[PDB]
Amino acid sequence: NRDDAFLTVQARLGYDFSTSLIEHAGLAYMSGQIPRVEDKVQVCGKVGFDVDLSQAQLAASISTMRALAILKQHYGTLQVVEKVLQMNVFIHSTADFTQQSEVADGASEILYEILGSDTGQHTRTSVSVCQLPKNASVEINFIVALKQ
Amino acid sequence: MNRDDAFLTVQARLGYDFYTSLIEHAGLAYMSGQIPRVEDKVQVCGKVGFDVDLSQAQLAASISTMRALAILKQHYGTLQVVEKVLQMNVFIHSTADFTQQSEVADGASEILYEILGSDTGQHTRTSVSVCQLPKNASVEINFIVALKQ
Amino acid sequence: MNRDDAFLTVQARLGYDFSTSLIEHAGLAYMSGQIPRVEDKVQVCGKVGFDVDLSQAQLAASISTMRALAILKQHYGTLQVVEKVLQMNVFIHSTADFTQQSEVADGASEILYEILGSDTGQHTRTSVSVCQLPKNASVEINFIVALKQ
Numbered sequence A: 001n002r003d004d005a006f007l008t009v010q011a012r013l014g015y016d017f018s019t020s021l022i023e024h025a026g027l028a029y030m031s032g033q034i035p036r037v038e039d040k041v042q043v044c045g046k047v048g049f050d051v052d053l054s055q056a057q058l059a060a061s062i063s064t065m066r067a068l069a070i071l072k073q074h075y076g077t078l079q080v081v082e083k084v085l086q087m088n089v090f091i092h093s094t095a096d097f098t099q100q101s102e103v104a105d106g107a108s109e110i111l112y113e114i115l116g117s118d119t120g121q122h123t124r125t126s127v128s129v130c131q132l133p134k135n136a137s138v139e140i141n142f143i144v145a146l147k148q
Numbered sequence B: 001m002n003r004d005d006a007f008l009t010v011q012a013r014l015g016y017d018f019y020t021s022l023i024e025h026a027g028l029a030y031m032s033g034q035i036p037r038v039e040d041k042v043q044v045c046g047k048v049g050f051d052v053d054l055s056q057a058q059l060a061a062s063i064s065t066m067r068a069l070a071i072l073k074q075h076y077g078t079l080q081v082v083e084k085v086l087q088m089n090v091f092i093h094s095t096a097d098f099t100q101q102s103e104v105a106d107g108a109s110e111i112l113y114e115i116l117g118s119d120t121g122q123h124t125r126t127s128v129s130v131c132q133l134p135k136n137a138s139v140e141i142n143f144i145v146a147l148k149q
Numbered sequence C: 001m002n003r004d005d006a007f008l009t010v011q012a013r014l015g016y017d018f019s020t021s022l023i024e025h026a027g028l029a030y031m032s033g034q035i036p037r038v039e040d041k042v043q044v045c046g047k048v049g050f051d052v053d054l055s056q057a058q059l060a061a062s063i064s065t066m067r068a069l070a071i072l073k074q075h076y077g078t079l080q081v082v083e084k085v086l087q088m089n090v091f092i093h094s095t096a097d098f099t100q101q102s103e104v105a106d107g108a109s110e111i112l113y114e115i116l117g118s119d120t121g122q123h124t125r126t127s128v129s130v131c132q133l134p135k136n137a138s139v140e141i142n143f144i145v146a147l148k149q
Helices: A002-013 A053-075 A100-119 B003-014 B054-076 B101-120 C003-014 C054-076 C101-120
Strands: A021-024 A027-033 A081-092 A123-129 A138-146 B022-025 B028-034 B082-093 B124-130 B139-147 C022-025 C028-034 C082-093 C124-130 C139-147
Touching: A002 A053, A002 A100, A021 A053, A021 B082, A027 A053, A027 A081, A053 A081, A053 A100, A053 A138, A081 A100, A081 B124, A081 C022, A100 A123, A123 B124, A123 C082, A123 C124, A123 C139, A138 B124, B003 B054, B003 B101, B022 B054, B022 C082, B028 B054, B028 B082, B054 B082, B054 B101, B054 B139, B082 B101, B082 C124, B101 B124, B124 C124, B139 C124, C003 C054, C003 C101, C022 C054, C028 C054, C054 C082, C054 C101, C054 C139, C082 C101, C101 C124
Parallel strands: A027 B124, A081 A123, A123 C028, B028 C124, B082 B124, C082 C124
Antiparallel strands: A021 A027, A027 A138, A081 A138, B022 B028, B028 B139, B082 B139, C022 C028, C028 C139, C082 C139
C-alpha cells in the first residue's frame, strides 16, 4: 500500500503534507516544487554556504513528498503511478559544491521507499543553479506515467 | 476565439516583428529554448538584478514566449492548433540575490493566458536562476505544447 | 546508413572508449543527464571560461553525447532503433562572462549528425550556463529520444 508508506515516511521526516499538474496521453507533467509544507519553504539557502548536504537531502525529500501529495490529491491514490519517467533536480548551491548526486539521492530514495524498487525507477538530472524562488535550496519537477 | 489577432496585438504593443526550433511527435510539439531575439539582435541583455530590473525581465520572458508562438503560427498557420502548453521551462540569468523568478515567469504566463484563454493557456512551469545564457541574454524559455489534430 | 559503424569510427577519432540511465514509455526513451564520464573517470572537469576553453567544452559535450548513444546501443542492440532525438538539454558549468553556450552545444549536435544522419539526428535543443555540476564536470546533457518499434 503506497499511501501507507507515504504516511510512514512523512512521519519519519517530521513534516505533515496535507497550475501544478497537467495530464496528457497518460502522462502527468508537474510544475517545479520547492520544499514547502503549506507552512512555508522549509530549507532555504545556498547549499554549501547556508545549507549542508544533509539539509539539502531533506529539502529534496520534502519537494518529492510534496509532488507525491499533489498526485494523490488529484487522483485519490498513489496506485495510479505507473513510472516516474523523469525527475529534474535543481540545487541552489555555491560554486564549489559537487555533490549534486547525493542531494538528488535524497529525492530518489523517497521514490523507492514509497513506490517500490520496480515502480520507483526514474531518470534524473541534477544541476546547480545560482538561485531559486523564495531563496529555496532545491527545486524539482517530474514527468510521471499514469495507469489508465 | 481569435488567438491569431490577440497575438498580432501583443506583437504590435511590443513593437517587434515575430538545430531545429520545433519537432512534432505523437501530437506534441517540442520547442528549442528561445532567448529574447527579434530581427537578429538580442533584445533585453544582461543579468536580472544587476543590469535588468523586474519589468525588463518580464518583458524578456514575453519576447521569448512571443518567439515560440510565432514559430508555432509559422509552422501550422494558426494558433488554433494549440490544445495545451504542457510545460514551460524558464531560465533566468540573474544575480545570486534575485528571488523573484516567479514574477519573471509571469511575464510569459500572462501572455499565454491573454492569447489562448484561461483553459488552453494552462501550463505547468519551472522557473530557476542560471549563471549565464547564450549571447548574454536575460531569459531563455522552452516549451512542450500539445497540439489539436 | 549504418550508425553502429559510424559510432565506432567517431569513437576512434575522439580517442575515448565508450564501450537508472534510461526509461522507455510509449515509444520514447527518457535518458538521465550525462556528464563526460568514459571508463569511470570524468574527462573534462572545470569551469568553462576559466579552467576550460571553448574547444574543450565542445569536446566535453561530445563525450556526453557519445555516452548517451552508447547507452542507447547497449540497451537496444543497435542505434538503428532511433527515429528522432526529440530534445537535448545542455547545461554548461561556466563563468558569468561566458556567452558561447550555442557553440558548446554544437559539440553535441555535430556528434548526433555524424552518427545518425542529417534526418534522424535533428533535435530541439536548450543550452544554459549553470553554477556547478556533479563531480565538477564542465557539461551535462539529457535527452528525450523517439524510437521506431
